[PDB]
Design a protein around this ligand. Structure first.
Ligand code: HEM
Ligand code: HEM
Ligand code: HEM
Ligand code: HEM
Lengths: 146, 141, 141, 146
């Protein structure tokens, strides 16, 4: 979708510093705890009944890393979001049946975590850009839906 | 919708926010105007530049209101009625915009209170802000 | 969120629904399963074929519940608590799905009661169903 | 987006019988009364304070017809939704600033009105198809957004 070029540059320079293990684990964890209906999709992961057990669950941490990794393939491929995520959009829709509203929820939590980790470096203007990216990923995962 | 634990969580979190509620309110407004352009619409009479006195003064009013709600959590409907009439009846704010401001509020809190913004506390804050929003759009439902 | 007029509107509309609440419930389920495939997920143990006895029996239970709520409109939280625990805690139904069922409910009412489903009545019904949904997902907020 | 061919045929045969003046007037009217924050965008139309005055407002009736007309250009152009609505997506976004959530709201009300008008002829299976079409239009009006 784009958004600008001084902009893409600021987004790329932040990702340089993103620890996908750490951010992804927390982001997925955040999701499971704030929005608890999303727990339904991760039953194979075992105990998710409380905040301590989610955040400390090794499968959560591992899946989170995998999610933030694909987010990363997104950030490095903003010209072709719809192509990068096609396979994944079919997986989430045809197979797992996740309502796409939840993609938005996860992208927002992602933004909150980046904000927590980077502090005053995560400027309003920088969040602005990431809101775009996250919206881009979410739409691309909703697509080749049917 | 607010359980005892959530009320405890919210009261505690906000105490850590202290005298900054005003500043956070203004920053949250900024992050909204920049990240979700559609919301700039409700504020024509406003200088939306990036360190403007109106957003700052407006930011203070929002923080003041959120503080009030924290001290009224068991009767939010009563304490926020002036505010509900304004947003729903006069300004006819699209309810989606409350979700957007809420997200930006949590974004701000995370920036300035990273150690206190734990998962448990984030969840309770989300619940709180969903409840403030629901009252502020009740002239709808 | 429910004003006096809305309560009047809802009580009146449902009286016109009468002994059909069950049938409408089942049809609404159908329209949901067909129009919004993602919802078929909550019902594996169910024969979702197009004139099946489970959806019909389930349809009856939903209508029964909605009737109860109409007769309790001032304390929906109290009357629907068994139901809130089930949907939010056991089945962990995604809250979006309530919007979807609600739409299908209004679709059904419109089909069978075209003369009674006026704009005023549609608005009150929407408000009602938003309120039932909010109680049924309160273990969330 | 498509959806099927016995399906497109059923959708097209219903539109044959759609009175765009009547349906469009009611649909727009329904919108303004159930979701009242949408009234904000139609202030130039005058009195919309109550159900009788909305449904009877000549500008509402006229704009509604215009909306259902473009919906119709959608229904006859399902292969190229994103192209049919491009101009309109820019109008609604850049100019009027309508959150795209409202496109969904209007498409749903549209479905309810069709249901009211056609009764038992508007089958579950037929609503299913129209839910697709309406979702298609809504996504196409959200697109070439930025
Ligand atoms: C930012 C949006 C999201 C991205 C980028 C994403 C990405 C992924 C990826 C890459 C996988 C593994 C694919 C593979 O290697 O085969 C996956 C699996 C999965 N995702 Fe998503 N996901 C997102 C949102 C969600 C949401 C909102 C849900 C909630 C239902 C969800 C539920 C799942 C589940 C259940 C799996 C399967 C995990 C398993 O193996 O058991 N995802 N996701
Ligand atoms: C937590 C949610 C919110 C709270 C607690 C809140 C609170 C307030 C308060 C206390 C005022 C009083 C302003 C004054 O006295 O001058 C106000 C004004 C206003 N609010 Fe909100 N608000 C919220 C969300 C929103 C949203 C989402 C919008 C739309 C994007 C909005 C738009 C406005 C506008 C346009 C005014 C009038 C400002 C003026 O004309 O001076 N508010 N709000
Ligand atoms: C107006 C909103 C709703 C009402 C009033 C309602 C009411 C009920 C009631 C009374 C039952 C009891 C079933 C029984 O005793 O066997 C039930 C069961 C159930 N409901 Fe809902 N429901 C609503 C919405 C939904 C939604 C949106 C979903 C998910 C798409 C859902 C999924 C289920 C499931 C899976 C069961 C269990 C059925 C079984 O296992 O036999 N419900 N509901
Ligand atoms: C099905 C989705 C919608 C379609 C297909 C649609 C279509 C249209 C069309 C064709 C026009 C006139 C374009 C022209 O001839 O220049 C228009 C105008 C307009 N629409 Fe939409 N619209 C939709 C949804 C909405 C929604 C949800 C809103 C709520 C804000 C909205 C607000 C407006 C406004 C304010 C105008 C300008 C009317 C005027 O001249 O004052 N529309 N729309």
């Amino acid at each position: 979708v784009q958004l600008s070029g001084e902009e893409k540059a600021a987004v790329l320079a932040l990702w340089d510093k993103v620890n996908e293990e750490e951010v992804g684990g927390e982001a997925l964890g955040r999701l499971l705890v704030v929005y608890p209906w999303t727990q339904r999709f991760f039953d194979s992961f075992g105990d998710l009944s409380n905040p301590g057990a989610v955040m400390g669950n090794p499968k959560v941490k591992a899946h989170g890393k995998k999610v933030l990794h694909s987010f990363g393939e997104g950030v490095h491929h903003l010209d072709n979001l719809k192509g990068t995520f096609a396979a994944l959009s079919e997986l989430h829709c045809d197979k797992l049946h996740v309502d796409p509203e939840n993609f938005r929820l996860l992208g927002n939590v992602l933004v909150v975590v980046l904000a927590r980790h980077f502090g005053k470096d995560f400027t309003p203007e920088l969040q602005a850009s990431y809101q775009k990216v996250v919206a881009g990923v979410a739409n691309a995962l909703a697509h080749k839906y049917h | 919708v607010l359980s005892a634990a959530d009320k405890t969580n919210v009261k505690a979190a906000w105490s850590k926010v202290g005298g900054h509620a005003g500043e956070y309110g203004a920053e949250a407004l900024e992050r909204m105007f920049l990240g979700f352009p559609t919301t700039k619409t409700y504020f024509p009479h406003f200088d939306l530049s990036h360190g403007s006195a109106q957003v700052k003064a407006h930011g203070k009013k929002v923080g003041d209101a959120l503080t009030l709600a924290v001290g009224h959590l068991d009767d939010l409907p009563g304490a926020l009625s002036d505010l509900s009439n304004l947003h729903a009846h006069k300004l006819r704010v699209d309810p989606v915009n409350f979700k957007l401001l809420s997200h930006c509020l949590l974004s701000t809190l995370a920036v300035h209170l990273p150690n206190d913004f734990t998962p448990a506390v984030h969840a309770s804050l989300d619940k709180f802000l969903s409840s403030v929003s629901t009252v502020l759009t009740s002239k709808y439902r």
